[PDB]
Amino acid sequence: KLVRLPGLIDVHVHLREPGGTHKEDFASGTAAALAGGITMVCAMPNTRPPIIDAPALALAQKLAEAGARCDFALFLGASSENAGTLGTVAGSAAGLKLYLNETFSELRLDSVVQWMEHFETWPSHLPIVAHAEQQTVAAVLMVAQLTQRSVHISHVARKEEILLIKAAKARGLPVTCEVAPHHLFLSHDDLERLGPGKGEVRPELGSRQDVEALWENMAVIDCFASDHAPHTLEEKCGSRPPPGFPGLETMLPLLLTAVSEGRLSLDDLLQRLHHNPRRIFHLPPQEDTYVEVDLEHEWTIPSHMPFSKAHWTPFEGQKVKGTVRRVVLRGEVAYIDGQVLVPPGYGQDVRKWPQGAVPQLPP
Amino acid sequence: KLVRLPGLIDVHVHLREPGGTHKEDFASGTAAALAGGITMVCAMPNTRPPIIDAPALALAQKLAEAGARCDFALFLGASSENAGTLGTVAGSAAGLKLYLNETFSELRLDSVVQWMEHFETWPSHLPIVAHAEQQTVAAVLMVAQLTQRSVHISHVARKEEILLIKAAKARGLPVTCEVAPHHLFLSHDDLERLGPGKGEVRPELGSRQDVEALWENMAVIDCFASDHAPHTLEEKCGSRPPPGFPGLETMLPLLLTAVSEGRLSLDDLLQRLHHNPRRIFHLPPQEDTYVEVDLEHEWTIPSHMPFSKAHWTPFEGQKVKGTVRRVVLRGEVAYIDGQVLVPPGYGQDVRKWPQGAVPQLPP
Ligand SMILES: NC(=O)N[C@@H](CC(=O)O)C(=O)O
Ligand SMILES: NC(=O)N[C@@H](CC(=O)O)C(=O)O
Ligand SMILES: [Zn+2]
Ligand SMILES: [Zn+2]
Ligand SMILES: [Zn+2]
Ligand SMILES: [Zn+2]
């Protein structure tokens, strides 16, 4: 007996096109999304060129419209030069992304004054997301308060961070956050198996106590998002390994396993992979769209999942219970038991749908 | 014709006793203070042992009472273990010091949650000072807001930091700050002369634009404080140079030079070295205490000033106009033209004076 879920949304993926297409492209990354029960993705801007101006966004939109198999929205990225320049295209983007710490990314900012300038100039009704680790969470929260608006914190990975956010929420501050599956299902204890290259990710894998703190504070977690960050094995195993894990194909199976163990409920999962993503990023519904999963099927994660060009996975060898059997996207069968059945280009930019524009007061 | 100033206060000095007495001790450091026209100092807790518990404070109090030539208050330092343990001795200290970045200091904290715990447990009516650089300023400001209290930011050194504080003040937030003379009178341009060892200090020397931004934003600066941080030349020139400059003997002459050039007024100076220190740290007046200075005398800073055991200075070769001629402390001549005339032990702990206790609501 299969369980029907709504179309799930991953608000944090790296699809590497343009410029890193050996790692992933729109076609392979969205195939990976569909296989993981995800029907809508928000693609991060740290591509090559990065999506930091109108011409780069225009290019990315056409690449996505031609390559994507599921629906999508594209982030703009904040740079040291583009504050106050994105107003005409801002509403066409998923939101604005700030990279506030060292990681795989034209996009580190030099000064908190630059963060302020972005918070002041980006339209107030549109989403802002920050990569903000440890004390940087507190710092960007301060900037959000000085500028009287909200912020969404990406991949929370530490007890320190989740408790800070918890304290902010208790004070009524408008902050939301997401947690990635590797920070719920991997820890320092796995670094021996993974090794130092494969194990590179930002935020880094946490201690057992970090992992336990995220589960204990599930009520504080608004969204799950994969931070699908594909790099090839050669890259992960080489002399200067980039940080990141692929995760679209493994996220839902990992979480369904946790549901079957009673670690969270099916509703808890759907709030975090469907409802809260919709409401935080003002993402539209998808007509005639759903995912059928099998919660009984036990399997072991192989050395690589079928679709991502990353062709490796840090979850290799983990036992899971839960499978994506079928995905229907806008009335077409998109995925069945390992076969993707919609072509590159089937996917659409949800920000161009009338119901996908973010409501605003007349300016 | 001499100008009579009130007894000046330096809220940020490192006197190195106990445990680093080859660099400075209470007797030599307070001689340096008097020679610089300073009659009251607040001594930082990063000694050996550090002042992080009642027994260390008790030891430091006796050392200071026996060695100090001018009046003083002693900071407590925050550690990863002492939150919620300092209540009985808190009121006897200058305030609580948090070390939030890498520097010469049992006292880095591991987590912003630890900062929160200190802000929650330290008595609300008593001062808290943070060493907080760059984004850490924003982060500690967030913690202060979550806990609904004030914070004083030590040695602001960057355009980024002063503008962040300016923005916080414009929002009515209770934050004050100080700036040290090296961040007003030295910059990157001096590193060639200083070299990489002598030039080590935290916050590091800023760009010309940082220096210009501090002067332009003088209205935002509540206090000047030396961050007198003596280390010997051998240490500064050796293979692992500690950060810090000695500065008690040079601070007032540098600032008086600026006054004579019309860069700020005598009042601007006295607000920042007397009135604002008093009001932020609840420091008592000193009866029959004053400083006589000569604003006409031109001289060149030598390779070392007479008193500090540091026996070097990064201001060597700078021309100044302005001299401390005489200091009277509580009715005794304490300093005249290079001669200190009060013995070690003349100085007193101002927190033990009835007028030096911080007022509080009945608990
Ligand atoms: N998280 C990572 O380790 N890498 C991400 C960048 C990011 O999300 O910060 C990537 O794009 O490779
Ligand atoms: N500022 C420095 O470079 N050094 C200070 C420590 C401090 O004030 O942070 C010291 O005590 O040596
Ligand atoms: Zn990130
Ligand atoms: Zn990412
Ligand atoms: Zn400091
Ligand atoms: Zn200091």
Curated annotation (Swiss-Prot), chains A, B:
Binding site for Zn(2+) 2: 12, 154, 178
Origin superkingdom: Eukaryota
Binding site for (S)-dihydroorotate: 16, 46, 202, 231, 243
Compartments in which it is found: Cytoplasm; Nucleus
Active site: 227 (for dhoase activity)
Misc: GATase (glutamine amidotransferase) and CPSase (carbamoyl phosphate synthase) form together the glutamine-dependent CPSase (GD-CPSase) (EC 6.3.5.5).
Subunit architecture: Homohexamer. Interacts with CIPC.
Protein name per the record: Multifunctional protein CAD
Source lineage: Eukaryota, Metazoa, Chordata, Craniata, Vertebrata
Gene label: CAD
